[PDB]
Amino acid sequence: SEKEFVEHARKAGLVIPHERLERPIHLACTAGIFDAYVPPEGDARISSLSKEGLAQRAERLKKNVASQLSIRKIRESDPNFKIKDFPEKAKDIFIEAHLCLNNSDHDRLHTLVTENCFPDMVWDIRYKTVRWSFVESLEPPQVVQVRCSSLMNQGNIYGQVTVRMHTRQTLAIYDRFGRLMYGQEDVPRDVLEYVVFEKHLVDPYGSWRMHGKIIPPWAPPKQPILKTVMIPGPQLKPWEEFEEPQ
Amino acid sequence: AAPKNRRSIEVNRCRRRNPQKLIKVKNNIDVCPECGHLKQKHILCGYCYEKVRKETAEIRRQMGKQEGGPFRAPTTETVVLYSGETPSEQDQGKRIIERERKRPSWFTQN
Amino acid sequence: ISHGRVFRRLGLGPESRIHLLQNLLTGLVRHERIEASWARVDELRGYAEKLIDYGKLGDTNERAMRMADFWLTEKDLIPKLFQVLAPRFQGQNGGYTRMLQIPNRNEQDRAKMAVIEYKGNCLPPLPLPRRDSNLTLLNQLLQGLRQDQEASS
RNA sequence: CCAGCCCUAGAACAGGGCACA
RNA sequence: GGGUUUACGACCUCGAUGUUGGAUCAGGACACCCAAAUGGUGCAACCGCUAUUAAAGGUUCGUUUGUUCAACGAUUAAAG
RNA sequence: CUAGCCCAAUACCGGACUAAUCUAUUGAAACAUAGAAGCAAUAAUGUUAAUAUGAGUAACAAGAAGCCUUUCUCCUCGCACACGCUUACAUCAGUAACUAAUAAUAUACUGAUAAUUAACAACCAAUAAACCAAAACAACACUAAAACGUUUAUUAAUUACAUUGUUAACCCAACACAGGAGUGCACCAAGGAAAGAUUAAAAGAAGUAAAAGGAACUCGGCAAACACAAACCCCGCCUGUUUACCAAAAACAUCACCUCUAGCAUUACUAGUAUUAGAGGCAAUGCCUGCCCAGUGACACCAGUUUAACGGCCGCGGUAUUCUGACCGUGCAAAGGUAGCAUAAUCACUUGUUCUCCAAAUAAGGACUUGUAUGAAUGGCCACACGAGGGUUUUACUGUCUCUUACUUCCAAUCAGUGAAAUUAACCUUCCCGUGAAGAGGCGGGAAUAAAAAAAUAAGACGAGAAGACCCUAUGGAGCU
RNA sequence: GUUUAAAAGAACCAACUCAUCUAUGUGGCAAAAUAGUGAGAAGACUUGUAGGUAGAGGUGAAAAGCCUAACGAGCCUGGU
RNA sequence: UAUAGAGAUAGUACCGUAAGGGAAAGAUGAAAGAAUAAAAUAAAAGUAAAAAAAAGCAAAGAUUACCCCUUCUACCUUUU
RNA sequence: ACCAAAGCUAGCUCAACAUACUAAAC
Ligand SMILES: Nc1nc2c(ncn2[C@@H]2O[C@H](COP(=O)(O)O)[C@@H](O)[C@H]2O)c(=O)[nH]1
Ligand SMILES: *C(=O)[C@H](CCSC)NC=O
Ligand SMILES: [Mg+2]
Ligand SMILES: [Mg+2]
Ligand SMILES: [Mg+2]
Ligand SMILES: [Mg+2]
Ligand SMILES: [Mg+2]
Ligand SMILES: [Mg+2]
Ligand SMILES: [Mg+2]
Ligand SMILES: [Mg+2]
Ligand SMILES: [Mg+2]
Ligand SMILES: [Mg+2]
Ligand SMILES: [Mg+2]
Ligand SMILES: [Mg+2]
Ligand SMILES: [Mg+2]
Ligand SMILES: [Mg+2]
Ligand SMILES: [Mg+2]
Ligand SMILES: [Mg+2]
Ligand SMILES: [Mg+2]
Ligand SMILES: [Mg+2]
Ligand SMILES: [Mg+2]
Ligand SMILES: [Mg+2]
Ligand SMILES: [Mg+2]
Ligand SMILES: [Mg+2]
Ligand SMILES: [Mg+2]
Ligand SMILES: [Mg+2]
Ligand SMILES: [Mg+2]
Ligand SMILES: [Mg+2]
Ligand SMILES: [Mg+2]
Ligand SMILES: [Mg+2]
Ligand SMILES: [Mg+2]
Ligand SMILES: [Mg+2]
Ligand SMILES: [Mg+2]
Ligand SMILES: [Mg+2]
Ligand SMILES: [Mg+2]
Ligand SMILES: [Mg+2]
Ligand SMILES: [Mg+2]
Ligand SMILES: [Mg+2]
Ligand SMILES: [Mg+2]
Ligand SMILES: [Mg+2]
Ligand SMILES: [Mg+2]
Ligand SMILES: [Mg+2]
Ligand SMILES: [Mg+2]
Ligand SMILES: [Mg+2]
Ligand SMILES: [Mg+2]
Ligand SMILES: [Mg+2]
Ligand SMILES: [Mg+2]
Ligand SMILES: [Mg+2]
Ligand SMILES: [Mg+2]
Ligand SMILES: [Mg+2]
Ligand SMILES: [Mg+2]
Ligand SMILES: [Mg+2]
Ligand SMILES: [Mg+2]
Ligand SMILES: [Mg+2]
Ligand SMILES: [Mg+2]
Ligand SMILES: [Mg+2]
Ligand SMILES: [Mg+2]
Ligand SMILES: [Mg+2]
Ligand SMILES: [Mg+2]
Ligand SMILES: [Mg+2]
Ligand SMILES: [Mg+2]
Ligand SMILES: [Mg+2]
Ligand SMILES: [Mg+2]
Ligand SMILES: [Mg+2]
Ligand SMILES: [Mg+2]
Ligand SMILES: [Mg+2]
Ligand SMILES: [Mg+2]
Ligand SMILES: [Mg+2]
Ligand SMILES: [Mg+2]
Ligand SMILES: [Mg+2]
Ligand SMILES: [Mg+2]
Ligand SMILES: [Mg+2]
Ligand SMILES: [Mg+2]
Ligand SMILES: [Mg+2]
Ligand SMILES: [Mg+2]
Ligand SMILES: [Mg+2]
Ligand SMILES: [Mg+2]
Ligand SMILES: [Mg+2]
Ligand SMILES: [Mg+2]
Ligand SMILES: [Mg+2]
Ligand SMILES: [Mg+2]
Ligand SMILES: [Mg+2]
Ligand SMILES: [Mg+2]
Ligand SMILES: [Mg+2]
Ligand SMILES: [Mg+2]
Ligand SMILES: [Mg+2]
Ligand SMILES: [Mg+2]
Ligand SMILES: [Mg+2]
Ligand SMILES: [Mg+2]
Ligand SMILES: [Mg+2]
Ligand SMILES: [Mg+2]
Ligand SMILES: [Mg+2]
Ligand SMILES: [Mg+2]
Ligand SMILES: [Mg+2]
Ligand SMILES: [Mg+2]
Ligand SMILES: [Mg+2]
Ligand SMILES: [Mg+2]
Ligand SMILES: [Mg+2]
Ligand SMILES: [Mg+2]
Ligand SMILES: [Zn+2]
């Protein structure tokens, strides 16, 4: 007669069991971006001409002292590190990561992108179908800036490299029922992004992993969705009156 | 008396699925033209009545705070005014309750 | 067989029903608007009308005085009944109360509930059910019929 | 036609009334 | 010929078919007590005695007794 | 006839195969040959666990409004201690679910934190002597002879603060149970709420009222009543005790009266001593208790004595015209039933006969009385008082009844929440006649027959409940003599 | 409390103790209760605490009663 | 191999005043410091998906066709 | 589709040997 129920699922963590951990948390990456590169508002008009863009890009890459000392730090920490063959590897990593997210290959996707890039690109898409492809690239990827974050508590250095890409992709996100949701699979839309890769320099392996994706604030808005959206108003209690904002 | 045999699921279903035991649909449901909530055509609106009841409870709370006793009822009429209002020539000589809230849109001055 | 019965059985008997109605009438006189069960309010409405009539009978009437003394349990409401409720009901004949069925009680009993209110009180007006305007299709058709009947005379 | 409200109609469901006033 | 009494038999029930009288409600048979239609009489009349047909409807209230019965009081068209 | 694998079955008997396991050798998309067994479940009112039917049925709960804990309507088992339970107590927070037989939330669930502080209570001198003289307002007394104390002498470590019980809405009854519970205070100044919300069907429970009659009802005046009185018998003298849980009595005990058994000392009887103490009978009191020691007991160890010890107290025939038999003959006994009462609580006949009571009586009371089976301490006859004992009358009273009715409350029906029980082979679960393990829903011959709810009545399901308690059987028991 | 020269195994009637009769209840509030009505109520009276008598027995104002909800003889264990 | 094997997760909860009796209850993964957690059965009885339409031990012969037609007195035990 | 279902382990049983037989905590 005396019986009760069990399995009341509750998640309650405290600072005492958080800090009495025997081994610290090994992080293969940092939280976010330390020094975000703010691009000039004239990219849309300088990307039209080849020489006037590449010249300014090389000037910005060579004249900044912070980027130069960071490249020197990466060079002294790991040999055979050159910036000339870096954009090709960055483009390869980008295309293979997008193909891995297309094929739903979470293992190779984890090997390619880092722990800050994986959730932001798998969470809202794990229940959908993607048809992404690579057709053309008008402007080759260009290394904009290079930064390095050194924390002396553990003695760990993370080298981040920002690469501006002008890419031409075909994106089509389908629904879990099979209907088209976002865009067509044949329209080669032009995208401009700034991929921030990161690498742990103290690590013996130290693979290059995509860390962040910067979009300029003046970038054109994304393509409209196919369906319509209703935005609800403030759900009013009986003893509350609506206030019309003007 | 005790049952002679076990009633089968067939007869049990025939008994407790008869339309006499099913929940009947209501056709007197309408929307309230004021707040848009659902109500019956012969019953007051729950939302509007809750608004009026909250306002009435606040008014009664203030009018009871005005009278420091349980057996202290006014022998004159009463008038409730809101922030930014003054007693008229017809409302003078009565008890006055003053609310800091602005006058609601449904409360008519009269 | 309950043919020709006008009072419903309430409480623990006739005296208990009288006491329940007396408490309800005291509350109604005090607050000018109360809410209770639909049956109890429907039973109390007639007593409220008769109480307003007895209050209109005057202050110096010993019958009305003792009736108010019996019914109004809180003795501070008898001057109220005789100097607020009765004077403000002078041109009216029988339209003293307003009873409206409110939704069922949110408690588990789901009782059929009503609200009773003395007309002309200092409280927010209940959301009374208003009829349709004359600008409705059917009402405009009936207005046209009425105008035709007026012109035909 | 049957929301509601009354009933000399009724356990529930049914049934009779709701314009004179 | 019937299966109302007592008996006879021991066929169904002893992992239960509860046993007399009453109260309530009665269903049915007729081998009819009354009521209805007749025959015979040693049927004068009133009362009777038998027999035939008919079962839609009735068939009382009390004292004693646990009583079914039984005795008694008052009646009823009769108290089957 | 055409093909075959070429002739039914209960108890018992025989044979050939065989499911699933383990082992020894094969096999390795799960098998073969052998050897072993905890070797096969449609049935034991079978065991365990889970599920259905009954059934969303029986049943269960929170007074009202309100400014939200403030005022109204009612009923009154409250405070403390002892005993007992141990934190269920207090503050804060939460309740989706678990406890409250439902919610609201919370003294009854969950978690954290706190608490009951000694002056009240517990533990808190011995050794000898003086001590007969009750408590009951105790002045003074009665019988049943009655707890409760000081003083004197010898030793009693001697020096602040020791230890322990301090909450509660509580205990014993499987339960937050209409039950059982010691003591001192008061009857409210303290405790609480009969209704979750409607309607006002039947039936059921409780109450109030009722024309005329007033027991005509019924086993009975049971119950009820505006009555709450007077008498007659039976049985027990009376008060009292008894079958906890179907019998409270006429049963037991009882004062009184009778029998037996004992001449006596350190644990009963008894710290008593025949006017005493035990083992018993019968029942106050009044009149009495008649005969018998033949048998069986007990004293006497054989005679003999004992019945207020166990127990018994007679036939057959004729007689005073015609009915009885004062009387006689004969026989057996230990004596042959005395007084009294008597159709009784007394075998049957019996509803014996008669008088009173009633209009009517197998009722009650008074008489007659062989009761051939009454009867005298296993006691017989009357009497006062007494009895929730068993019967009978007289008024009074009334719904007991003629002959029921009206209205309230709990029930009831609907709505909302929670939610059992006996029972159940499966049912797609009609009626009549017949038949049949001898009373049919299931068979036969006929009639009837859209399907499902809800509310009522109990004729049947040889309805449920309890392996009939009556009867019999058992080479089954047990109590008593 | 009342009546009594009375604390009289007297009387009326409370607390209290029993349980006469009826009606509900009958898997119920309850493995014996509720309501009304009853009997005793200064005594052979009720009752608190603590101890004793233990089953071939105890105790018994004999009902073959009671001895931890089933007693013509408790319950548990073992024989089993 | 968790209704088995010791009663045993334990002589513990719980039931009795006591002696004494005496249980049931475990199942992921290398990692849950992999619960926007991943895969195999979705196979008992009981329900839902999906209440029922004359007639009858509920089936069989069948049939274009679920019933409608025709035929068969549930099973064990105990008994003549 | 709910209710549910399946693990292989905890451990037990019977013997042999055996120090020689009321474990640990006290
Ligand atoms: N003694 C005896 N009993 C028989 C014989 N045959 C049948 N029975 C009994 O009859 C019963 C079964 O009836 P049956 O199956 O023979 O009709 C069983 O009790 C069985 O023992 C017989 O030949 N001799
Ligand atoms: C007699 O017929 C019997 C009585 C037994 S009571 C001693 N009744 C039923 O079996
Ligand atoms: Mg109509
Ligand atoms: Mg016969
Ligand atoms: Mg014969
Ligand atoms: Mg026989
Ligand atoms: Mg024979
Ligand atoms: Mg029998
Ligand atoms: Mg049977
Ligand atoms: Mg008849
Ligand atoms: Mg005839
Ligand atoms: Mg005639
Ligand atoms: Mg007849
Ligand atoms: Mg042949
Ligand atoms: Mg054969
Ligand atoms: Mg084999
Ligand atoms: Mg076996
Ligand atoms: Mg099985
Ligand atoms: Mg049974
Ligand atoms: Mg059964
Ligand atoms: Mg079985
Ligand atoms: Mg159910
Ligand atoms: Mg319900
Ligand atoms: Mg039912
Ligand atoms: Mg009910
Ligand atoms: Mg306890
Ligand atoms: Mg609850
Ligand atoms: Mg708590
Ligand atoms: Mg206390
Ligand atoms: Mg009510
Ligand atoms: Mg209540
Ligand atoms: Mg209620
Ligand atoms: Mg009724
Ligand atoms: Mg009645
Ligand atoms: Mg009366
Ligand atoms: Mg009368
Ligand atoms: Mg009579
Ligand atoms: Mg009679
Ligand atoms: Mg009486
Ligand atoms: Mg009397
Ligand atoms: Mg009298
Ligand atoms: Mg006596
Ligand atoms: Mg005397
Ligand atoms: Mg005694
Ligand atoms: Mg008894
Ligand atoms: Mg007793
Ligand atoms: Mg009795
Ligand atoms: Mg008595
Ligand atoms: Mg005697
Ligand atoms: Mg003498
Ligand atoms: Mg005697
Ligand atoms: Mg005598
Ligand atoms: Mg003698
Ligand atoms: Mg002798
Ligand atoms: Mg001799
Ligand atoms: Mg005489
Ligand atoms: Mg006799
Ligand atoms: Mg009589
Ligand atoms: Mg004799
Ligand atoms: Mg004698
Ligand atoms: Mg003698
Ligand atoms: Mg008497
Ligand atoms: Mg007595
Ligand atoms: Mg008596
Ligand atoms: Mg009437
Ligand atoms: Mg049928
Ligand atoms: Mg047969
Ligand atoms: Mg048979
Ligand atoms: Mg038949
Ligand atoms: Mg047939
Ligand atoms: Mg037939
Ligand atoms: Mg025919
Ligand atoms: Mg029946
Ligand atoms: Mg019934
Ligand atoms: Mg049958
Ligand atoms: Mg029967
Ligand atoms: Mg039966
Ligand atoms: Mg038997
Ligand atoms: Mg019996
Ligand atoms: Mg016998
Ligand atoms: Mg034999
Ligand atoms: Mg033997
Ligand atoms: Mg006395
Ligand atoms: Mg009583
Ligand atoms: Mg009464
Ligand atoms: Mg009393
Ligand atoms: Mg008395
Ligand atoms: Mg007396
Ligand atoms: Mg003792
Ligand atoms: Mg013996
Ligand atoms: Mg003895
Ligand atoms: Mg005896
Ligand atoms: Mg006896
Ligand atoms: Mg016992
Ligand atoms: Mg086990
Ligand atoms: Mg076990
Ligand atoms: Mg299934
Ligand atoms: Mg058929
Ligand atoms: Mg037989
Ligand atoms: Zn509204």
C126 found inside a domain:
no
C107 found inside a domain:
yes
CB B61 within 8 A of CB B55: no
**How far apart are the C-alpha atoms of A235 and A213, rounded to whole Å?**
36
Show which positions of strand F are touched by protein (CB under 7 A).
52-56, 62-68, 70-74, 96-98, 102-104, 194-202, 406-410, 415-417, 422-429, 451-454, 461-464
Chain C interface includes B50 (CB < 8 A): no
Within residues 41-100 of protein chain B, the ones with CB less than 7 A from nucleic strand D are: 41-42
Whether C29 sits with its Cβ under 7 A from any strand F atom: the answer reads no
**How far apart are the C-alpha atoms of A31 and A160, rounded to whole Å?**
12
User: Cβ-count burial of C77 within 10 angstroms (0-12 exposed, 13-18 middle, 19+ buried)?
Assistant: buried
Chain B contact set for A243 (CB, 8 A)? none
Q: Which domain holds residue C110?
A: 10-121
Chains that touch A (3 or more CB pairs under 8 A): B
Helix segments in B4-103, DSSP class H: 9-16, 46-66
Show which positions of strand D are touched by protein (CB under 7 A).
3-10
**How far apart are the C-alpha atoms of C113 and A234, rounded to whole Å?**
31
A149: three-class secondary structure by DSSP: strand
**How far apart are the C-alpha atoms of C36 and C116, rounded to whole Å?**
8
Place of tokens 């044949």: A186
Residues near A154 by beta carbon (within 8 Å), at least 6 away in sequence? none
C3 is in an annotated binding site: yes
CB C50 within 8 A of CB C21: no
User: Cβ-count burial of A211 within 10 angstroms (0-12 exposed, 13-18 middle, 19+ buried)?
Assistant: buried
C19 is in an annotated binding site: no
Output the CA–CA distances (angstroms, integers) from residue C79 to A113, A191, C30, C52, in the order listed. Answer: 85, 84, 11, 13
Question: Where do the DSSP E strands lie in chain A?
Answer: 129-130, 133-151, 156-170, 173-174, 189-200, 209-214
User: What is the sign of the dihedral through the CA atoms of B15, B17, B20 and B23?
Assistant: positive
Question: Where do the DSSP E strands lie in A15-112?
Answer: none
Are β-strands B95-99 and B78-82 bridged in parallel, bridged antiparallel, or unpaired? parallel
Output the CA–CA distances (angstroms, integers) from residue C10 to A136, C13, C20, in the order listed. Answer: 87, 7, 8
Instruction: Give the per-residue SS3 of A223-241.
Output: CCCCCCCCCCCCCCCCCCC
B75: three-class secondary structure by DSSP: coil
User: Cβ-count burial of C88 within 10 angstroms (0-12 exposed, 13-18 middle, 19+ buried)?
Assistant: middle
State both tokens at B50.
């809750």
Chain A interface includes B28 (CB < 8 A): no
C53 found inside a domain:
yes
**CB-nearest partner of C124 from B34, B77, B106:** B106
**Contact between B49 and C76 using a beta-carbon 8 Å cutoff:** no
**Contact between C129 and B56 using a beta-carbon 8 Å cutoff:** no
Q: CA A132: distance to chain centroid?
A: 17
**How far apart are the C-alpha atoms of A80 and A62, rounded to whole Å?**
19
Whether C2 sits with its Cβ under 7 A from any strand D atom: the answer reads yes
Q: Which amino acid, A73?
A: K
Characterize A45-79 residue by residue with b for buried, 16 or more Cβ atoms within 10 angstroms of its Cβ, and e for exposed.
eebeeeeebeeebeebbeeeeebeebbebbeeeee
Intra-chain end-to-end CA distance of chain B, in Å: 70
Place of tokens 């208990």: C16
Task: Quote the Cα angle for B6-B8-B14, to 5°.
Answer: 130
Chains C and A are in contact, defined as 3 or more C-beta pairs closer than 8 angstroms:
no
Chains C and B are in contact, defined as 3 or more C-beta pairs closer than 8 angstroms:
yes
Best residue in B30, B38, B44 to probe C by mutation, most C CBs within 10 Å?
B44
**How far apart are the C-alpha atoms of C36 and C23, rounded to whole Å?**
12
User: In which region does residue A214 sit, left (phi positive, over 0), alpha (psi from -120 to 50) or beta (all else)?
Assistant: beta
CB A61 within 8 A of CB A87: no
Taking the centre of ligand 69 as the mean of its atom positions, its distance from the CA of residue A142, in whole angstroms, is: 109
Task: Enter the resolution in angstroms.
Answer: 3.0
State both tokens at A134.
């690579």
The DSSP symbol for A84 reads: S
State both tokens at C94.
């029988």
The total number of structural domains in chain C stands at: 1
Backbone angles phi, psi at B55, to 5 degrees: -60, -40
Can you give the CATH number for the domain in which C39 is found? 3.90.1030.10
Q: CA A54: distance to chain centroid?
A: 24
CB A141 within 8 A of CB A87: yes
B22: three-class secondary structure by DSSP: coil
Nearest CA in chain B to A239: B51
β-bridge partners, B39: B30
Nucleotide closest in space to A24 (CA vs C1')? H33
Nearest CA in chain B to C29: B73
**How far apart are the C-alpha atoms of A197 and C8, rounded to whole Å?**
84
Instruction: Give the per-residue SS3 of chain C.
Output: CCCCCCCCCCCCCHHHHHHHHHHHHHHHHHHCEEEEEHHHHHHHHHHHHHHHHHHHCCCCCHHHHHHHHHHCCCCCHHHHHHHHHHHHCCCCCCCCEEEEEECCCCCCCCCCEEEEEECCCCCCCCCCCCCCCCCCHHHHHHHHHHHHHHHCC
C104 found inside a domain:
yes
